[PDB]
Amino acid sequence: PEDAIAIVGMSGRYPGARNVREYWDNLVHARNAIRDIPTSRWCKSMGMLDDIEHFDPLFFNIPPSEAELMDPQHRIFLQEGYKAFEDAGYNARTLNEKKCGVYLGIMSNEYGVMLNRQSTGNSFAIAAARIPYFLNLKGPAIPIDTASSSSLVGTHLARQALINKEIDMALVGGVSLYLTPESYMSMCGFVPGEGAGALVLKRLKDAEADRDHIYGIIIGSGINQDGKTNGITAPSAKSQMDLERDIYETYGIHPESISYVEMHGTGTKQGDPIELEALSTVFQEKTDKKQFCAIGSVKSNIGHTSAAAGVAGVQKVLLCMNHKTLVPTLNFFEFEHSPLYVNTELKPWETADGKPRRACVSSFGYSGTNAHIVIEEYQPEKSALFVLSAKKEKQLKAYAEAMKDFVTSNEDIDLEDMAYTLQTGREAMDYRMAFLADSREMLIKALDDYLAEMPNGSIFAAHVKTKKSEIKDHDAKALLQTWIEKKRLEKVAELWVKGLQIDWNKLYGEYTPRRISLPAYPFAEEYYWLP
Amino acid sequence: DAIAIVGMSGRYPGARNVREYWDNLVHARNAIRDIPTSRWDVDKYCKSMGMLDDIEHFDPLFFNIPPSEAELMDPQHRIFLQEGYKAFEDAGYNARTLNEKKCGVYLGIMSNEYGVMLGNSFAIAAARIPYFLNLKGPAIPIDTASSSSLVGTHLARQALINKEIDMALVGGVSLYLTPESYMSMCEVPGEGAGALVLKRLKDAEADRDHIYGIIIGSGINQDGKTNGITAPSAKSQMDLERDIYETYGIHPESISYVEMHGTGTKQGDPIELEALSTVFQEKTDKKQFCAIGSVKSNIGHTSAAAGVAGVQKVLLCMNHKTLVPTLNFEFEHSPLYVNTELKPWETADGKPRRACVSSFGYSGTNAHIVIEEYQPEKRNRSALFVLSAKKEKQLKAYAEAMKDFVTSNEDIDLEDMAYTLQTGREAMDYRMAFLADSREMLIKALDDYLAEMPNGSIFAAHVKLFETDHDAKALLQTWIEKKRLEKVAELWVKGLQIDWNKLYGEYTPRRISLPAYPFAEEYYWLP
Numbered sequence A: 001p002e003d004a005i006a007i008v009g010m011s012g013r014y015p016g017a018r019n020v021r022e023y024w025d026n027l028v029h030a031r032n033a034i035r036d037i038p039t040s041r042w043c044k045s046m047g048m049l050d051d052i053e054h055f056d057p058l059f060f061n062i063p064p065s066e067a068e069l070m071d072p073q074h075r076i077f078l079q080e081g082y083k084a085f086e087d088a089g090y091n092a093r094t095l096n097e098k099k100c101g102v103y104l105g106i107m108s109n110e111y112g113v114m115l116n117r118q119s120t121g122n123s124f125a126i127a128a129a130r131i132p133y134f135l136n137l138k139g140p141a142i143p144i145d146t147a148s149s150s151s152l153v154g155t156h157l158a159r160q161a162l163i164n165k166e167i168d169m170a171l172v173g174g175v176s177l178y179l180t181p182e183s184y185m186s187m188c189g190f191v192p193g194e195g196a197g198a199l200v201l202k203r204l205k206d207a208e209a210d211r212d213h214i215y216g217i218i219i220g221s222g223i224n225q226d227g228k229t230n231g232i233t234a235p236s237a238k239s240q241m242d243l244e245r246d247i248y249e250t251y252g253i254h255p256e257s258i259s260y261v262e263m264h265g266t267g268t269k270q271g272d273p274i275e276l277e278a279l280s281t282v283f284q285e286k287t288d289k290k291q292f293c294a295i296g297s298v299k300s301n302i303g304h305t306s307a308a309a310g311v312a313g314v315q316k317v318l319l320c321m322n323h324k325t326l327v328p329t330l331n332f333f334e335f336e337h338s339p340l341y342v343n344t345e346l347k348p349w350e351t352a353d354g355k356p357r358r359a360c361v362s363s364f365g366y367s368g369t370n371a372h373i374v375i376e377e378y379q380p381e382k383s384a385l386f387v388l389s390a391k392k393e394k395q396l397k398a399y400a401e402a403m404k405d406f407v408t409s410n411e412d413i414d415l416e417d418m419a420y421t422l423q424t425g426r427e428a429m430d431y432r433m434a435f436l437a438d439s440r441e442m443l444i445k446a447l448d449d450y451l452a453e454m455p456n457g458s459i460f461a462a463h464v465k466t467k468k469s470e471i472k473d474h475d476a477k478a479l480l481q482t483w484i485e486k487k488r489l490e491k492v493a494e495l496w497v498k499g500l501q502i503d504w505n506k507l508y509g510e511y512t513p514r515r516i517s518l519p520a521y522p523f524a525e526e527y528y529w530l531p
Numbered sequence B: 001d002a003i004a005i006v007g008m009s010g011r012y013p014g015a016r017n018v019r020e021y022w023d024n025l026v027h028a029r030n031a032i033r034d035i036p037t038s039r040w041d042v043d044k045y046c047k048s049m050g051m052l053d054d055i056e057h058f059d060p061l062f063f064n065i066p067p068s069e070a071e072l073m074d075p076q077h078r079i080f081l082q083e084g085y086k087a088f089e090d091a092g093y094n095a096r097t098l099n100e101k102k103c104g105v106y107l108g109i110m111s112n113e114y115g116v117m118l119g120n121s122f123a124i125a126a127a128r129i130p131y132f133l134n135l136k137g138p139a140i141p142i143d144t145a146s147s148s149s150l151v152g153t154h155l156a157r158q159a160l161i162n163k164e165i166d167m168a169l170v171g172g173v174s175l176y177l178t179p180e181s182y183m184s185m186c187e188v189p190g191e192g193a194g195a196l197v198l199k200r201l202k203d204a205e206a207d208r209d210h211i212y213g214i215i216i217g218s219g220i221n222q223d224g225k226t227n228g229i230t231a232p233s234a235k236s237q238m239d240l241e242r243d244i245y246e247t248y249g250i251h252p253e254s255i256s257y258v259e260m261h262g263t264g265t266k267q268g269d270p271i272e273l274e275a276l277s278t279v280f281q282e283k284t285d286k287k288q289f290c291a292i293g294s295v296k297s298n299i300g301h302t303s304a305a306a307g308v309a310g311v312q313k314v315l316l317c318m319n320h321k322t323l324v325p326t327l328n329f330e331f332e333h334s335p336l337y338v339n340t341e342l343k344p345w346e347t348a349d350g351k352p353r354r355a356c357v358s359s360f361g362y363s364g365t366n367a368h369i370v371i372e373e374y375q376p377e378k379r380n381r382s383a384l385f386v387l388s389a390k391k392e393k394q395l396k397a398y399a400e401a402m403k404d405f406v407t408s409n410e411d412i413d414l415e416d417m418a419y420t421l422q423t424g425r426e427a428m429d430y431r432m433a434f435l436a437d438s439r440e441m442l443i444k445a446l447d448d449y450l451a452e453m454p455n456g457s458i459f460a461a462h463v464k465l466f467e468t469d470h471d472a473k474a475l476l477q478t479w480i481e482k483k484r485l486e487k488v489a490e491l492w493v494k495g496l497q498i499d500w501n502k503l504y505g506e507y508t509p510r511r512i513s514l515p516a517y518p519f520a521e522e523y524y525w526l527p
Helices: A020-028 A064-069 A072-088 A111-116 A124-135 A150-163 A204-209 A237-250 A272-284 A306-322 A393-409 A415-424 A440-452 A474-485 A489-498 B018-026 B067-072 B075-091 B122-133 B148-162 B179-186 B201-207 B234-247 B269-281 B303-319 B392-408 B414-423 B439-451 B470-481 B485-494
Strands: A005-013 A100-105 A141-144 A169-176 A195-203 A216-225 A260-262 A293-296 A340-342 A358-364 A369-376 A384-390 A431-437 A459-463 B003-011 B103-108 B139-142 B167-174 B192-200 B213-222 B257-259 B290-293 B336-338 B354-359 B365-372 B383-389 B430-436 B458-462
Touching (some): A005 A020, A005 A204, A020 A306, A072 A100, A072 A169, A072 A195, A100 A124, A100 A306, A124 A141, A124 B365, A141 A150, A150 A216, A150 A306, A150 A369, A150 B148, A195 A204, A195 A306, A216 A306, A237 A272, A237 A358, A237 A369, A272 A293, A272 A340, A272 A358, A306 A358, A369 B122, A384 A393, A384 A415, A384 A489, A393 A431, A393 A440, A431 A440, A431 A489, A459 A489, B003 B075, B018 B303, B075 B103, B075 B122, B075 B167, B075 B192, B103 B122, B103 B148, B103 B303, B122 B139, B139 B148, B148 B167, B148 B192, B148 B213, B148 B303, B192 B201, B192 B303, B213 B234, B213 B303, B234 B269, B234 B365, B269 B290, B303 B354, B303 B365, B383 B392, B383 B414, B392 B430, B392 B439, B430 B485, B439 B458, B470 B485
Parallel strands (some): A100 A141, A260 A293, A260 A358, A293 A340, B257 B290, B257 B354, B290 B336
Antiparallel strands (some): A005 A195, A005 A216, A169 A195, A358 A369, A384 A431, A431 A459, B003 B192, B213 B365, B354 B365, B383 B430
């Protein structure tokens, strides 16, 4: 049991959703993001990402000329993988030399082909390794290609390595794009889908000790093969049942405790009756209770997203748990006498009696390698100085807008958690701004003044350069401390924007706030494609 | 806990199998050659490679694959199907006994060229064996460039220890089908394909598998930030090695050979030396007690297959208690020496030999494992030899491989051989059987069969009221207990299923390594 794995960070980019918050808002409103394929790229519809050519190579210390040579899958994953770490409240400083493994679901290598007719950089290997190379992580970095089960197979491997104590953190993800018509048509009536997502995992006990924010807990997982089926793309009912049963047995999970399953299938393809029967039979081995478990699939919203399917599904489940809300599955065997029902409504996600909500995700690929994972709701033991920095001023401004939007959408935000998170959970980069605020309304006002260039005496800003501070010595340091303990946050703000390193923990005595989810770095949006 | 290696098969430059491989290493053969035109023209684009031969050859029918589909199959997939399959037979397992096993498959593979030249995903590559044999453990390709097969080994080990699977097939395959992929990798590339079969040690002992050696530790990690992604990290290598020795309680003084990642002559190689040497020195002042080398000096740098090629070299050295040369920093004050000799591999009294293998890749993901010699417990007339193939021509070819093997192996235990042929091979449709009670009679029967000598001593047929009738079954049994092996032979070649265990009373023989299926050498390339 105390082999529980916490999910402490997430980031996701899917058709119709540039981030996890849009994603949620789309699911809540039952939005279908599938569109007709346009000429700009080249059945006839697809869940597509937008602006797949955009990248911020300088952020990652990659020359612009090399960006053109990078598979966009690699680029987009670097970006999302990175943002997941910030979502968790981790930065370059705090990640440097961590034994963080990286497990990257990825199943196509098309861009490299496209280029070699003009001309290695675009291997699966290098894809997995870009993040560790950028952030100096020390856990293994392994791409996983099991077709559509990839990101969920990666999740299982990460879980096992954490439980074994071989790593102390994992980044697991997936990414899929269809850059040629050929790659589309390899999928498929699977409406093929694009996407890219990442999760950050730690052992639960480390997540609690370090005071991470915890979206949920993985309490079981397993993987297996179909073996011999009637054609390699056809599923095995027995293999699915064995998978599910073996996980529930191994980790002592009673099927009655499970109230949602994020299916592999949409309900409407060839293999999908089998998935339904298998799950239902395994549940019925242990209970005569009827229609207590909702099922659905986000593939009805965003298409069948290949290697990223697992991470997209997990993220949906976590978002449902966090809001205690089940959301429709779109356009979906004898349900009446089964444990299952198809949830087509937006409704509260109910629990029995304080018991945490539990859900599964399934992900089964064309090559017959299957994965299934069980997730449990985490049930916690439940003037500020705001700082923002970016590597270019234009990105700093975009940061301040993303923060303003977030505060405006989220009347509930705890201001002290937000500031603490901005202090300790983001890297101080060269273009810097800071301000004081004691209420939500003051906070919005400062951000608005900063954006509108309205003077405001609570706002400070500078570009680091190579500054001339006499403090960095003894008597000056003692004064800084004096300012902290007297809460002269103006003075702290002023110096911090000019480049002075502040030990943020000293701002806090009795009460220490918590890192929470905030929007992550707003990457430049620069175009790079085949030279 | 301990993982047994119970089967292996390998195909490397200059070596069609693991027996030629050994013979090549013992004689210090270098299999690297000039690239010929049949591959491509080097002059239109260095110039040598460790190459496999007949990379186009495949037996699609054996695997229930249409000939036309073979042409569409990447030869990497084809060759691994063959070697992976043979590793199972090397262990003494067949379709019948593998059906529905939770055997996982971990396949190191790093290039997809044939598909471009034109089903051929890494995913499908890993999965062809499970689909053919109906295995139920996960099937996962691994691409960490050159560390791939050794990273796969680590993942298999962990899954076995956790009890998620009960067997693993781990392997690697690399070919250079275009000048482009050769040149890139090159910033001497080697081809190859190999597999190992792994089980928990306790299951291997209970099932009476033959055990080449034991994996006693492994780990994997990442260089992280280096000066360019292809450059190594001295610290990561030391942390890797140290963390493994500490975690699994292995003292460096117990280690007497290390199969290096590098040959000793390339950019990153001074770093590998210094890292390993430093870690060893943290624990001992002993000097020059650990030999080092690399089979890449013999067969080229074999990419994804490097790990399995290295592990196999180590096992073969342990089995023969022999260290072999490596071909072509201040050693004197180090724990290490470069072994350039063919010499006996010594241990201080009793203790099992221990060795490591390292495998680093262009993407910075490193693996290292520690292997220990297996030391079996002491063990406590006519035998019936049976051979079968799916085509008569392969049966004949099988007869010749067995004859060569018996001829080369003057101390084979005949009973173990027959038992292995009985219980450790599938009975296929073209069948032959004979009796023999000595090595020389065994060779003679095989020779007569090949020469189609009217013998009467040899039974053969192409596939039966001993199935239906109660009293007929009883008679068969009566024949067994009276050791009327001629009668058993006769019926078996016609298709009667025999319960081989009944031939054995209180003394049961053991499965050993024998040559594995001789695939039909049929050419398939681009349609």
